[model samples]
Structure formats: structure tokens, C-alpha cells
Target: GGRRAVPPNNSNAAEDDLPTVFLNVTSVHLFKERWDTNKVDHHTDKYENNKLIVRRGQSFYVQIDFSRPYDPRRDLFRVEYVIGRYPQENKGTYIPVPIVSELQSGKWGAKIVMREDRSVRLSIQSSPKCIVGKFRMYVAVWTPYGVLRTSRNPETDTYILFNPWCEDDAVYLDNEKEREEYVLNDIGVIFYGEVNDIKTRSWSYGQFEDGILDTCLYVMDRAQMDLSGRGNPIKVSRVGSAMVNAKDDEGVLVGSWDNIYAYGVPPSAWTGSVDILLEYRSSENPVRYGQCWVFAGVFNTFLRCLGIPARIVTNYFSAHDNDANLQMDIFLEEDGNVNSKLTKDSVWNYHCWNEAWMTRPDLPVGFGGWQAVDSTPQENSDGMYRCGPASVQAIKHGHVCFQFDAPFVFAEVNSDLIYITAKKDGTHVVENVDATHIGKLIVTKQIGGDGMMDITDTYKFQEGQEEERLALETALMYGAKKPLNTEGVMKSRSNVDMDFEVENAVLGKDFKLSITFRNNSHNRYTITAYLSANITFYTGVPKAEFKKETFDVTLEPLSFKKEAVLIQAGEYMGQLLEQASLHFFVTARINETRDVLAKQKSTVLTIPEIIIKVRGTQVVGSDMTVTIQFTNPLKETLRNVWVHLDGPGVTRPMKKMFREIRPNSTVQWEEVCRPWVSGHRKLIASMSSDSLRHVYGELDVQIQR
Candidate 1:
């Protein structure tokens, strides 16, 4: 069957360049409506934004209306999919494959899921490991007569994402319930505040909100990530953590721990990911501003948008390890005042981060599920401000030597809290070592449930438990991690213990901080206490000092002394920057012994919740009215109040602004939406006022077909 090769002929350039009979597709039905309804495109049907969205590693339908049904032997046909500003065929993001009988391994594939005549439907399957982003596809056909290709249409732009449903995918998730919760659920819960008072703010992780899916992919584009490396969820997620903040790139959120959010809204004012992502894309600039929880929520939304299984995890009393020695150092002066410059480490009241589920082909076994990824710009990794995709398993067992910032992330949940005192002679001494103070009550939203699920056991065995001790030692061998406070350091003693307790309140309401001094010594002593209140970030930095109260009190042996400091609502209103938690610090000096004791505690106001309801028939394709109403819990009038409503496949993101709401007045915002995705559809709304923040509400309507 050997044949001679023909030499190139350019004499008849016009005929040589053109094939005989020109051909074009009469019609192309991307199955625009039927994909995500089933496993073909899977749960992505909820996007409902007219754009074709699909998960890689899944088979979806694309119907072709042709002039005739020609055999594969006689006709060559395939669809060419292209992506990137400067697309290259070598990269494989530019793809063209046949409707063959057998699919290719880890490559873009096509087949006739529905085959036969002029009107033929092909199951267009992307390579299970394709890069996730916006892709445009066109049909190509070649025969003896002529070669033809359909026009590249932006309307037919297909957005590809990772697939948790496919076993072959790196981000595969086995549990149906978990996939529904992490990848499909549009509602999210972010826990904040101190360990004693765990408060939650409802966030709309509106991945399927209109324009949001596009915006999510737009982030990938703006990040300028390696187009081919996006196939790996590990790298994809690591980049996501970096892109969530504006420290490096024009990321989604600009972090502002200080209350000075002048040009943009405060972090607490942001209640949903839809508004932030849309604003980031619309302005082509990172939105201002966000704290730890806001960064986690927006990153969670991006993960879900890209079909990755992820959850928001809150670790109360989290640590920020500056030097990565796995310890938080709070350096105090000889007089018991905190030394700002030397206090290089801090233990946050709580920190919110994301945990994405994926297999670790890059590491050893048992290091895959729920990798911790933080995007708060706390520190940089490899020249960029990004934190993880670090294995939670590595963090739990103290195996800090691994890919990413595992050493840093492990410190967040297991670092020892060290209190150091700086003396007048420039000498530093270890004052106290609190083993269990850094990480406590590691919680997340329970699977398919609204209640909290404690995951502290997964992070550590127990505080100072036998196994936990071994893990800490194991960490030192892996890295040159020598914490300042350790077992080798001799223990110190304190006679006077000070406790600062402040009552929680709503905005515009007064609260009181009660300081209690307990003398543990047998001898009587005079204790001088200095108390102050400052607005602090959840990430553990004091923004401004608002109140100060000093007291001289006599303490007897085995006795307790208490003093009350009133916090006026009117005086503190102007200084509440992020509208965040308040930090109360009390430093007491025992005159008889020259010993000092300091205690700091954080108090968060319980933000009001909006009452939400959906009226009208809850059915697919039916119009329903979403109503949000809330009564002002403040005496002062609320100003610049903005209410936002959004739902996946139910309603587009809607924002309603109110100029002012008088004292104790009830305000309401309502809008209509048509349902596109059936089953329990979640609708979420948030109300943010100039005087208040984190007022959010949500409801799920059972949309039946």
C-alpha cells in the first residue's frame, strides 16, 4: 500500500489554497439548556446565565445541523476549542478532536452520544485534565472536495472548570452531600469572634450568580497563571489563595485591617461574594476592603465556581507566625505594657481560611483531603503573597516539611502562645507559655447542615496530649524551627491574675468591660491596673485605643477585686473602622513583688439579622417575590444602608440602597425572581448600614419542576 509523496505545487495558488466545495454548519445547538440538568455537565446547570458552562472530565452534548450524514472514513470532522489571548496548539488548551469510538487518555475527546443523520448530537467531552478557564470552540470539517470551519462565536464561549464528580479528576469528591454543600451551595457561613463567643455571619457564596461565573474565570485570566498548569487543582488552588488579595496582583479583594476604608466599603460591609467579585471585574481593580473572613468567603466562591470541593474553616485563637518557628510571641515591657516593635508574633481572635479537597500526587500518602489555603496576605511564599494548599494532614501531625506553606499554616492551629517581657536592661525574658491558647474550637459549617461542626481533633490530638507532644518534636527535625518558648525553659510564676471581660452588644448599643483581679499568693499586696480598649482586627492587630481606665486597688490573700468600666456607644461610633471586634487589655503591676500580669480579650458586637422570606409559588420557571425586612436595633439613625439579594439560577445580584432609617424603624427590600434550577434553591440577602455591618439573611425555597 506504499504510495509516492507528492511535491508542493503553488502554481495555481488560488485553487491550491481553497478546497473544492465550501461547507458550513447550518445550525449548532450547544444543548444550551439540557447539560447541567444531568451528569453530562453535572450540577453546573445552575449557572443559568446563557453562557455554556461545563466541568472538565464530563461528557456534554453539542448538536450539529449538517447538510448530510457522511461516514467518518469519507469525511474528517471535529471541533476546535481555543483559549488564551495568544493561544497555541502545542499547549493543548487549543484542542480539536474527533467523534471517535474510544476516548483519549487525559486529553480532549469527542464521541457520538447521540448519532445518526443531518441533525446529529455529539457528546463533547473535554480532557478530564483540561485547564480551567474561558474557552471558545468552533466546528471543523475536511473532505476531498473542500475544508471548512465554523466561525468562532463569542456567544458560544464555553467556560470549563474542574470536576469533583469525576474520579479521574484531581479534585474528585466522593460524597454527594459534601459536593452539594461545598461545590453547589450558594450560601456560606463564616465564623468569627473569640473562642468564648463564636459568632457566624451568613455569606452568599454566589458562584452561579449571573456574571459571577465569568468573573471567577476572569480572575484566572487576570492572574496570568500558567494556562497549562491550571489542570492541577493543587497549583490552581495555590494561585487562588494568592489572587484573593490585592497585595500582589489586581486580585479580588484589597485587605484593610485598619478601619480606614475611605475609597471603598469596609470588610464587614461586604456580605456576599457576588458583589465583591462583580465589583472586582467591573472596576478591573481589587475591591476594598476585606478582612480574613471576607477573603475566605470570596476564595470559597471562586473554588465552587470552578467546580472544586472546598469549605471555609475557622480556627479560633489562630496564630500568625512571622518567623515560622511555630510560636506566637507577645512581648511586653517591664511595666506590663505591650511593646509593639518587639511583639513580632500575634494570636488572632479567630482566622477564616479555605480547605479544598484534592489528591496530592505531589506528596506522600495520607496528605490530600482538606488542604488549608489562606489568602489574607499575612506573608509571602516564593516572592508572592500567598499561603497554601498545604496539606491539613501535614499540619495535624506536625510534618511541616512539605510543599507550600505548611510550616506557617501548621503554626496557625498548633503554635504555642509565648509571652515575653522586655526589661530596662534590653534583656528579654519568657513570662508565660500557653500551650492551648493559639488554636481552639476549629469549626466549620456541618455537612449539609447549618450548625457548627468542630474539627479541632483533625488539627491536633489534644492540648499537650502525649501524641501532640511527639508531633511538636517531629516538626523541629523537619525544619530548623526552634520556637522561643519550649519545655527546656524553666517555668515562671505569677501571683496576680487579671481578667478583662466585656459584654457583647449590637451597633449603637452600650457595653461594659469588667476587670477582675485575683490574688493567688498567700500574702496581701497592692495591685495597680491599667485598662484600655482598642479596635482590633480578627487577625490580631490593634487599630486604635479608644478607652483607658487606671485603678489602684488593695488585694488580700486568696481574694478577688472587680472594677467596671462603661463603654459609651456614642463615643466609640466614629472610631469603629472595620466595624470589627474590640480588644480590651488590662495590665496590672503588683507593688509588693514587682511582678506584672497582663490579659487581653476580644469582644464582638452581635450584628442584627435580617428576616427573609420568599413569597409566591416555588417552582421552576415561576416568578417568586423575595422579601427582606429588618428592624433597626439602634437608637441612632442608620445611613448609607445597602441591601443585596442574589441566588443561583434564581435571581441576579440585586442591590438596594436606603438613605436613612430612623430609630427602631423597620425597613424592607423586596424583588421578583424566576427560578431556573429546581430542587432546594437558596436565596440570600444582606443589609449593611453606615452604623452597622454583617447583617445577613438567607432562605431556601423548594423549587419543584
Candidate 2:
């Protein structure tokens, strides 16, 4: 079991300064000869964002060995490694694990053999403090181009070759003027190897070109491009290649509303030039900023108006959802230049957006060479760049490198929205139709206590109001017990012609509600659903509360589900309603209820309708035992119920139970009233159940805990 006393750390502290993987080893070769003269600095996240160059119809072997001792015993080290696309953060989904060690291994390495025609980032990682040689490594394989050494025989050209040191300052120019002067004659080749950083010696020759072929150069390989320096230029030549630069427009950020077209060309395509119409729709609640259901439609409409294909994405976000209400980020990329900063990050939280796959001609790639050293003197905290703004000293020392691109086009919009009318229900009759609006319909089936269930539904409309109908089907796994073959339509606002039937349980015994709305025009429409259940635990003279975090649940597709909470305790006898009191709180959320917002609305009191039946006394070997009986008319199930009891001279009772009971059920239990000291004593009990579950329900106790 995991420890609960300590909560997981949530601080985004500097990874480098946190803790070091300290280890004591007796043997380490100083390599007195000083191999390679290039001093390789330690402690730098060197391979954090490395891209592997590859070609079509190629294969590579990706094998990783951890620094665990080579032993089949108890004392072993564990390591996890993976290879992924460059620029994108490591996502649990796309991350393909290459190796893992349950036992110890003194060292580990992997050969990431390349295949097909694609670029990828071969990455590796270990636990927080892995006492290993290196945390990551990457290598790329590619098909040799026809370009070969002019001095050597073309028949001797080989695809794979070791490091080759050449002393030629021949300028393989990338500019039109250089191409015009040299015909780009010098066929340069890049051989890879690990080198020293201390000395100013260019030994290994590895170089590559960016896709656009606009005179792009690489110091490492032909496919592997770099933009680590300022001003975004290409690094040409081997080991220590010179940089080439070309001028272009710099894009703006699109996370705010002031400049909706920060990274876009307004009045060009999306916006009308002379006569254009724009409509803005939004949710009123801060908890919900962007219109979840309709935001995508608007974007698609705009794209279609210009004969472009577009779509929007939706998902639960961590960053925006935590700090602000109705937060949205947008961007646009017209050229082939894919801005690097746009990618997925686990620490960034769950987010969704859209991308427009266009048919534009090829554009020259922006390589890394010239540093954007003084591009803009903005502070680090508030201002951000593509790769990341590392310290100048760190950059100079090769401690960090910025290779990603910035977002090309960006825009954002905001509104202090006021809802004249919000959508309450929808149907599939398709009555509402126009170029400016669309409608959505939601349906759900809820089952409560007494096994009584009804698919009751209703809705309110604004502009698009169409007649709707629905039915249910028996799902062996969950959803509904039987199929609903009936259907009805609503033609007006007040009354609904619904085809509903009750099954198994009594009417009103368990609260069941099902609803739907419609858009009069389309055969294809949006559908959403929600469900709630009632639960109660039988207990007498309640005193304490109960709670847990796991459950076995089964539901239909696309249904909005939530957990229900219930409590039961012994009731008090003071004259019903006005004299006695009863309080109830339930867990309400998804599967694992981690976020429960507690407030007045989250809790309920049944004291206003009090009803407690506590037995006077029972004779047991000249001793007396008090008994209590309670009944709750709820249809939900209660889990992990507990009760607390206390009085002046009565012994305090501590009892716990793990069970769930249906609503409208009766539970009775009595406690032995041992007069430990006895002096006008009155007993009280309180009870509670798990409230943060995956289903929707509540609990009530008639008597004390």
C-alpha cells in the first residue's frame, strides 16, 4: 500500500538542482591520454531534445542497456527507456519502451536502428536518482545520397562510414550568390561520433540539410538540422560548422484576446475583406470558458467558407482548467515551416486544439546557427521562446540548446458573456436550421432505489427547436437492462410527447431522468448523456462517517457519470422536524473522487423532517441495552459506513462496516448501554459513506451513529 501521510510533490522546481545520482565506484578510467581533445561536459541534458535523421525504406536496431549490474539476484537496478518524435514531449501513449531492468546491470546501451522515411527523437530516461553513466543517447541511420567524394572513386561510395577528419575550408554555400559562384560542387559528408568540448578542434564531420533545401546545412548530418543559436541560422561544415542566415517574419503569441490575430493574417482569408459577417458564442460560467459543443463548429464554418478543411479538438486541460475559466489557445501556420514550440507535454496537462493540413508548396527550413542573442531583451519568467531561454553562460558552455521553432500564426478572443438563453434540451427532428446556428441533443437513463427507473427527459431551446424522440436497448454488460423501442416527439416548449415506461421498481422510488433535444436540419447531430443513482446504508444510532476511493462500475457509451454519497445514523426523538436534527453528505465525482468541492449546497439536512425511533431499553442479565431502527427511501448504494457514539456515563462505541444497500431499505441495530459511570447520560450517533465515487447518489441516516 502507498503511504498517505505524505502527499506527492507538485513543485515545478529546477530538475538540475533537485538531487544528484550519487554513487561510489572504485574503478573509473581517467583515460590519461585525454581521448578526442573535445571536452564533454557532464550534468547537461544533452540528449533531452535530439532528433534522429532517417531515410525511406531503411531499418535500425534500437537496443538500450541500463547501468544496472549484470546479476540475477535481489540487489538490482531498474531503468526505463524510450524513443519518440523530436520536439514533442514524452507522452505515455506514444512512448514505446525499449528496455526495463528488474535486476542490476552495471551498464546499459541501445542501438536505435532507423527504418522507413521519417524523422524521430530517440530518447532514454531513468528514475529520479539513477546512479548510471548517462541518462540518454540517440543515433540515426539513412540511405546514402548520390553525392560522393570527387577525389575518390564513385564505385567505392558506401552508405555507412566511421568518423572522417578532413581539413578543407571549402565553402558549401547555402545562399543564391554562393551557389551561383561555386555550383555547390563540394559534396560534403558527415560522419558521427561523441567528441570533446574543451578544445577548438573540428574532427567528426556530420552534416545534414533542412527539407526546404534553401541552402540549409548541418554540422552533424544531412537530415539532422539544428537551430540552437540566435537569429535562427544553419550550422554548416563538420564538428565546428559556420552558420548561414536568411530573414523572415517573426510570429506572435496567441494566448490572449487583445490581438485575436496575433499570428494570423486578418481580412485575408478567415476575415472578410469588404463585407464579412462574424458571430461569437461563449459559455457564461468561468468554470467553462470556450463553448465546448459549438466552438468547433464555428472554426469549421470559417474554414469551409474559404474552401479549407478544418476541425476542432476537445479534452480536459490541466493548466487552463486550474488557473482560469474559459481559457483557450490558438495558432496558425501558413508556410511549411513547422514552429517547434507547439507540442504535447505531460507536465502541461490535458489539452485539445486543432490543426489545418494544407496543400502549400515546400518552404526552406530554418536551421540553428546564429543566436537570437538580443532578439528581444524580455525577462525569462513572463516571456518565452521556442526551444527555451537558457542562461547565457549555460548556452556558451553547451549546457543548453534551443532548436524548436516558434508558432507561426496565433490569435485569441474573449468575452464577458451574458446568456440571454442557454440550451437545456435537444431533439433529432431537425426543425431549427440556418447558416448562423446549430443545435445539440443530450439523453440519459438513470436508475435509483427500489429498482424503480424511468427515462424522464426535458429540454429548453433558444433558436433551433426541433421535435425529438428516443429509445433504449438492453445491454448485457451495463447501460440498460432492456431495449426501449418506444419514441415520442415534442412540438412545443412546455409539454413533451415522451414514450416512457417504468420497470422493476416503484415510481418515484428511485429518481430516473432522461432528456433529449434536436436540430431540425441534419441527419447527423451531437448526442450527450448523464445519469444519477440513489444509495442508502442501514444503520441505527449513527455516530461517525465512512469513505473510500475504488469501485466496480459499468455504463453505456458517452454517458456523463458521477458518484453518489449516503450516510445513516440513529435518529433523535425530540418532536419530529423542529426538535431533532439529521445531516447528510455524499461523495460526488468520477471513478476516483480526488476533487470534492465541499459547501452548503454539497451537504443536506433532514432535521426539518426528522423521524427517529430508538427503543427504550432491553434487559440483559440485569443490564440494559438501547436499540434504534432507521429507514431511508433512497435508491443508491452506500459503501464503507461507520458510526460514532458518546454520552456522559455510556461507553463510547467504535464500529465499522464495508457494505452497500439500496434506497428505501430499512436497517436496525441496538447498542448495549453499559453504565460505566451512569449520571443522566444521553447517547448520540453519526454516520457517513464514501461520497467521491463514480456514480451519482446520496445517503441519509434516520438515527444516531
Candidate 3:
């Protein structure tokens, strides 16, 4: 709902000598008696980058100070505040804090007073609503000239969170309905359409409201876990994770379906409806597919149904570190094609997960805010297909020693990156590596707005800084037997120097891998060499043989050879979009010493081609059409296809289902909606089937009256 600003008082406009009155720190107090002194300074730097954070339904006394004491009887002062909606986007509809006669009853009210010391104090009972996100507070002082409002920067005149989680602030734990709505209500989804896009789509979960959708009901009966039996909020979260992932089968409502392994289509093609998935899966009919975002959306529905303040988070360039070694390894061949058999690690273009708010009595203070738990079943934690309840704060601080796979979550956002070049003789040279590439632009839906909220800084430290490096190193050494370096442990060494001109690897596209191998030795030498490619997991275990080539040559006296290898997507179509990688092995043998030099190169698979366009006039309150066009570049027909539409003005998600799209065929569909809010409106569309997930495209629609 939109907020309402209080009417301006024009009673004292002519008097000019009113000193510049400024509102000072807006402090929160746990108790009324302490409202005057025991200020809870949690709002200050509670979030990274000076973002103001508050918990749902957390009651506290708020007091505002003034730059100078003013007579409350002589000057009209009202502490105005607005909750819900983006404070920065809209000229917030401010509401006056009513004067209350009593204190500390946990009711919302305000009072203006001149203390014995004669300093002006505007004390009020304040608490955030069940709603989350950024809001504003304005301390309006009716001066002779006009009403001066307090700003987010006390130095300024406006009060908005110029910059902008969960527990220790978990105010929703006592409410059962609130928890249920979070876990069960399939009402909203955080749609990620592309890796490079800054904003994403937020839509209603696409459930029919006529009470006719029985799938959610079926899930409620079977998958729902008893909150009473979970002991506490953290345990409830763990059980919730287990329930959604079908870990223990307390309720196995939705199976983790994947089609990328089948080489059919991307996971985005299935009906992007949680109710449908629930119904079909409950009836024992396999729904065919789901990827990270799908799992996150369904997992979000599960958590929300259980009344946990949950939201989906998208991590661009997400890391899949299979070795628990905090490093995503990529290997390159002299011929540019990947050596898939080298590293099990990969950097997914994007990955989605859910973050839930809760108080962690199980963890230390400050560790209780938003804890991330993923139901994607990508990796096993505690011997099950689960992850976290890991404290986001802990992850931010690189404190991986906490509970619920904190190390795993830490690595997801802060792991080091490694690139290597492999040779046919089994010798591998480390080419490039860094820790900043894994997690980029961690985002969530901005509450009360149509754009994505960049929470990347919240989950990660500033890259390339000494503090960030130290933090990551600390995390790497958390459970290790030895002190680890910021660069992570190197597993390979090489004598041959090589460089490749390959770009960021993508699925279903042929890129030339041009590698130049130079002989560093001064003496004349003759060596026999060749190149080979193998598909592998993140753990260095080979899965499929990608390609092989023999290069028998003699390098005369510090000479170099350049070779280009054409890696066709058709050769590895089934494995092209998987988390799997291509490991290219290049080797050379010196007949003089009977020694062999071999290197391994690897790169993760990417998504097929998908194009989404928002094709309509974007006028305020006018219907606009959105079109998603995708070409099945794969050789086989793609099934269970669908497109998910999201935008700032899209209150609910619009999803279109297609039975199938034949290989190499161009397909497109359309949807229409009216946008209410105006600005730089963005429409994000994701096309998915079994083999394709995260094939996203975006269009910016400028809304004008």
C-alpha cells in the first residue's frame, strides 16, 4: 500500500529568525526508561555501505534529537515517518507520529518535550511493520520560514535511507500465520532473466485465487513440518530446508527435477507455477525440470508458508566449489576448447537461493540476521542434499566456523578463482586466478518497488582490498589444518608458458580457443606434443571425452607455436549447459630425459541463446505487451518450455508454457499488462526448458504519463 504524507502547517511562515534546526541521530531504545539514554545504535552500519535495516514487528522506543533546543510550546514539531515502499523513488507519503500520553506499551505514538536540560526530544514508540525494505523518517520542525525535515544524512534536510535483515531482529517468529504465508503462499517470485542485468522481475507466484488450486493444499498436508516440533526458529529453518529439498521426506512435495542432464531443454520450460509443480509432483507425476531460481521460488514459497520472513536472492557469477577448497578452477587448452576433465569447480553465470530472517540463539549475536538456506540440492551438507541456515553476517565476515555449512556459503560468495592451461603431456600451467570473480551483484527484490535490491555488498567484502583479502584468508583457514593463503592452494605446476585468447565460455556457442605455447628454454630442443579434452565435474573427475588432437612438433631454440581449436557445441550438446566442465589436456615429451610435460584446462558450460523483448508503448496505467523470443540452437527438440515475465510494474508474474520448440526454430510469445508507477521500468524475461536455465533477456521501458 502507498504511504500518506502529513499535511504541511503554514501557520508560521513569515518569521525569519528561526535558527537552522536539524534533527540529530534517530535512536532506538529497547525500553522506555532507557529511551532517554540506552540508545540501541544498531541502525548505524548494521548493514554494509551504511544501509539502514530493521526487523519486522520488532518493537522499540525511538527518540529524535535536535541541533538546538527549541520550545515545544512555542514551535510546532511533528516527528513524521513513512513505512512501506522505496523511500528514494517516491516522495514518501509521510505520516505524523501521534503524541502519546504513556510510554513503553509497545504502541505507536510520539511526544515532543523540552527536557530539564532544555534540549528538544521527540520520543516515540516505533516498530517496523511486517513489511520489509527501506523506509523514511522525517522530523519536521515548524519554523517561522517553513517546516524543516530531517534527512538520512543529518546534515541534509530530507529523511530517507540514502543507502539501504533478519534475527536478533526476528520479530516474526511468534506469528504462525506470518510464517505460513512465507513458506506456503506461492504468491511471489524473484525472476532472474540475465547475468548482466542489474534489475530482475518480481511477480505474484501465479496461483489462481479462486481457492481451486488444490496443489498447495496437498503440499500443506504432506510437506508441511510442525513448527512446534522444530524446537526453535533455527531448527524450524533447517526442517524447512529439509522439507523443501525432500531430504528426510517429512514431506517430499516437489522432486528436484533436472533436464539439463537429458540434453532436451532448459529447466525454464516447465510450467513456472508452484501450484502446478506441487500438484503434479504430489500426484507422483514428474514435473520434468527446475533449476536454481525455480528451486529458490518454490523454496521461498515453502519458507513463507512456514511464516519465515524469506526472500529469493540471485548471485551472479555464482561459484560451485566442489572440493570445499574455496576455489573455482577453469582450465584452457592451447587450442581454446576446454579440457573438461580437470576441475570440478565452476562459476555459474548466476545462481538463486533463499534467505530467511531469524534469531540465531544457536549462533553468536550479530550472526542472527538473514541466514541463507538453499534447496537446490547442488551439493551435500551433513550427508544430505542441503545447504545452510548459514549466517549471512558470518559469511560476510568470512567467519566460516559457525553452524549449518557456513564454510560452504562463504565460499559461494567469496571463493578464489583459478585458470589453468593444460598440455597433452599432462603438465598444467596456472594461468590466472583471483577471489573476486565468484560472487557478483548479489540481489533481491526491492520491497515496495519494481527493481532489484543490490545486496552484494551485504554478502561480500569489497574486492581487492587488504581487509577483504584478510577476511577471505581467515575463512579459508577456518577449518583447515594449515594456514591458507589468499590465493588458495595450488594443485598444479608447469614449465611451459601458454596464453589463450578465449572469452567467457557460454553454452551452445562455438568460440575459438587460440593458445600460444612458447618454449622457454634457450637450448635447441625437439618435443612430441598433442592436445586432448575431457568433460569433468568441479572435483577434477572426468565425465565425458570432449575432444582430442595430436600435435607432434619440434620447438627450435626458445620458439613458440600458436594453434586454434574450434569447439563446436554440437559435439557436447548434452553436456554443454551442465555445471560440468571441459578439461583440455596438452602434453609434450622430451626424448632427451624421457620426461613428460602435461597440462589440464577447464571451463564450465553455459546456457543456450534466449532473447527477451518488451515490445509495447510504456505509458503510465497503460497496457504494455512483453515478448520473449528464443531460438533452440540445440540439435534436439526442447520440451516443457516456458517464459517467466517480471518487471517493476508487474505486480504478479506472467508465465507462458509451450509444449515444445523444435531444434533451430525461432519461437516467441507475448503478454500484456498496465504499469502504474513511472520511471525507468525494466522487464526481465527468462526462457527455460530442460537444458537451458538462466537464458535471460531484458528490456528497459520508460514509463511516461
Best by TM-score: 1
Candidate scoring better on TM-score of 1 and 3: 1
After TM-score superposition, the amount by which residue 175's alpha carbon in candidate 2 deviates from its true location, in angstroms, is 42
Write down the lDDT of every candidate, Cα atoms only.
Answer: 0.75, 0.20, 0.53
TM-score (all chains, Cα) for each model: 0.83, 0.16, 0.54
Candidate with best lDDT: 1
Write candidate 1's Cα lDDT for 73-119 as tens digits.
56668887766544556665567767778666666677776657776
**Candidate 1, residue 597: lDDT:** 70
**Residues 1-705, model 2: lDDT tens digits:** 377442321111101211112111112111112121111111011111122221101122222232233332322222232111221122221122333322112222222222222221122222211111111222111114321111212221111111001111111123433222112111111111001100010000001111111112111122232222100111211111111100121111112111123432221111110011111111111111111112222222222221122222222111221111111211111211111133111111112222222211112232221121211111222333221111212222222222211110000001011111111232111111111111111111111211211111111122222321121111112121112111231123111111111112221222222222222322222221121121211101122222222233333233333434222222212111210112222111122211111100011122211122334332222235544333443345655443333332333333334475556555555566644332233343334334211111111212221
Clashes of 1: 2
Candidate 2 regions with alpha-carbon error over 4 angstroms: 1-8, 11-13, 16-75, 80-468, 471-705
The best-first sequence of candidates by TM-score reads 1, 3, 2
Cα RMSD of all models vs. native, in order, equals 6.3, 31.4, 15.8
What is the Å distance of residue 24 in model 1 from its true position? Answer: 7.7
How far off is model 2, as Cα RMSD? 31.4
Better of 2 and 3 by lDDT: 3
Q: Find the 10 residues in a row with the least total lDDT in model 2.
A: 197-206
In terms of lDDT, model 1 sits at 0.75
